[model samples]
Target: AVEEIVKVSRNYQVTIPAKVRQKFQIKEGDLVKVTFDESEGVVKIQLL
Candidate 1:
């Protein structure tokens, strides 16, 4: 889970890992559900 080196970048812009993207069949245009949990201190990405 925490194995990825590239976390976030450019003014809170989160860079999605290619490994995960392929796993979830994430299309660039369809990638949008990014639920950042500040209170829980976790990142959640829901792809359709």
Candidate 2:
């Protein structure tokens, strides 16, 4: 697994890093689902 830290902007938006985007084949206008993992204290992003 790979990890990177990202910051949420004032608008509550987080930018996915280029490496991650490419690796996941994420693109503009793609649908994504965000959920919080309470146990892990982290937010999970899934490609929908």
Candidate 3:
């Protein structure tokens, strides 16, 4: 399956793509951690 991309709002909120949410079993109010990798110039999102 093709990976999905989502656009974040100016307020910094993003709607998790349904397919990715389902695949990862994410649900409402689930705890998530976001961090930036300075070296890679990327952001990482992980479930707690």
Candidate 4:
């Protein structure tokens, strides 16, 4: 897995990093899910 530091936009937006897109097949207008694990307390993102 690859990790990257991203700056959230003024509207609380995060542009997916290139390395992340490189690792997975993602692009514009993709379905993405951002959530926090209630038990583990970590942010998680999903794309489909």
Candidate 4: which stretches are off by over 4 Å?
A: none
**Tens digits of lDDT, candidate 1, 1-48:** 533567566687666677766666666578457786999988888865
After TM-score superposition, the amount by which residue 46's alpha carbon in candidate 2 deviates from its true location, in angstroms, is 0.3
RMSD of each: 2.8, 1.4, 1.8, 1.6
Candidate 4 colliding pairs: none
Worst 10 contiguous positions by lDDT, candidate 4: 21-30
**Which residues of candidate 1, in runs, are more than 4 Å off?**
1-3, 37-40
Q: What residue pairs are clashing in model 2?
A: none
Tens-digit per-residue lDDT, 21-48, candidate 2:
7677788999999999999998899989
Candidate 1 RMSD to the correct structure: 2.8
TM-scores for every candidate against the unseen true structure:
0.55, 0.79, 0.71, 0.71
Indicate the worst ten consecutive residues by lDDT in candidate 1.
1-10
- Least accurate stretch of 10 residues (summed lDDT) in model 2? 18-27
Ranking by TM-score: 2, 4, 3, 1
Off by over 4 Å in 2: none
List residue ranges in candidate 3 displaced over 4 A. none
Q: Quantify all predictions' global Cα lDDT against the true fold.
A: 0.69, 0.86, 0.82, 0.82
- The Cα error of candidate 1 at residue 21, in Å, is 1.7
